[PDB]
Amino acid sequence: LYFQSMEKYENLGLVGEGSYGMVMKCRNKDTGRIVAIKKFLESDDDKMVKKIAMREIKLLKQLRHENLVNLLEVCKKKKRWYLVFEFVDHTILDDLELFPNGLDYQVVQKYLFQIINGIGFCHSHNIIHRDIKPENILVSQSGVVKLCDFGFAEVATRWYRAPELLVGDVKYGKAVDVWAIGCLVTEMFMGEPLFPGDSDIDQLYHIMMCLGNLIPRHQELFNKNPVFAGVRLPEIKEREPLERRYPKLSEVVIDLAKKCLHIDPDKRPFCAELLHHDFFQMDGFAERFSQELQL
Ligand SMILES: Nc1nc(Nc2ccc(S(N)(=O)=O)cc2)nn1C(=S)Nc1c(F)cccc1F
Predict the structure, then answer these.
(1) How many domains does the chain have?
(2) Whose CA is nearest to atom 26 of ligand 1?
(3) What spacing in Å lies between the alpha carbon of 227 and ligand 1's midpoint?
(4) Measured from the CA of 85, which atom of ligand 1 is nearest?
(5) What is the extent of the structural domain holding 47?
(6) Is 120:74 a contact under the CB 8 Å cutoff?
(7) Domain ends where: 89, 124, 151?
(8) Rounded to the nearest whole angstrom, what is the distance from the C-alpha of residue 258 to the centroid of ligand 1?
(9) Residues assigned a catalytic role
(10) Residues 181, 43 within the same domain
């Protein structure tokens, strides 16, 4: 773990103009290339957290894929460590600012294909993201998706959280990322969030209005938790299915979203199985696009 110097970097702005906190957009004075810099460790005197930080850096160095943000170097200034990543030119929210009523069908296919490839690679290594959202789906000048801000390195948005996260189930796994992917499908097509809750309970209400009652395990976790004393989740006798909410979306798109958003985590597809879906396979999109990305 060679540490490099922060002296070669000059501040251009904050990445996202504050919406990400203290993540500095910087230029390398020697090469002209642009980076994102985030503080990683407050003090390397603390030998306990030091060891944990070095473990995480080792993972970041090994976890290399075309759809993951590139860690370039680790810098040390005094006792603090900073991670320096390749700066990626925009995010999917930038696309949606230009097109606030939704993106082009083929644009959605290309972005979801790459998100799935990136998450699938992580899953193949037993790495869960756990915090997928539009603000961490970066997009290069050439349209390559770069994922970032994995849940291994509040008023935090709950909009993409699966039911198992919302009730605090310790048995969550890879299926949380498939759920978040499902949330992205309608949002990229329609230009609005699927389930924009403002708390754990509100989020659950939004989910349940559409998708019905939770699995028994999850309802039990909710009902046994003292934090939710005095509050109940709704009985749903009449839900509002996705196709009623978005009657102009094709059946193929709705079907993909519905599979990802199964209320039972065990009945969601594996991330990699998503690429088998008609949404990607129709007209040979998938083979054609794969060959394109290589070439
Ligand atoms: N490496 C990298 N490039 C970018 N680019 C980017 C991000 C936001 C925006 S925006 N849409 O203008 O706020 C434009 C470009 N963000 N980025 C990182 S790692 N962003 C990031 C993040 F997405 C989440 C948490 C911490 C972070 F540092």
Answers:
(1) 2
(2) 149
(3) 34
(4) 1
(5) 6-89
(6) no
(7) 89
(8) 29
(9) 131
(10) no
Q: Report how far residue 251's alpha carbon sits from residue 205's, in angstroms, rounded to the nearest whole number.
A: 25
Residue from 73, 129, 138 to probe ligand 1 pocket by mutation (most atoms less than 8 Å from CB): 138
- 256 CA to middle of ligand 1, Å? 28
174 and 270 inside one domain: yes
Domain-terminating residue out of 65, 89, 113: 89
Q: Has residue 127 been placed in a domain?
A: yes
Structure token digits, residue 19? 């919406």
Q: Which structural technique was applied?
A: X-ray
- Documented resolution in Å: 1.5
CATH value at residue 194? 1.10.510.10
Nearest alpha carbon to residue 280 among 261, 254, 252:
252
Q: How many CA atoms lie within 13 A of 185 on its CB side?
A: 26
Number of H helices, E strands in the chain: 11, 8
Q: Give the CATH number for residue 17.
A: 3.30.200.20
CA atoms of 226 and 179, how far apart (whole Å):
26
Q: Which amino acid, 292?
A: E
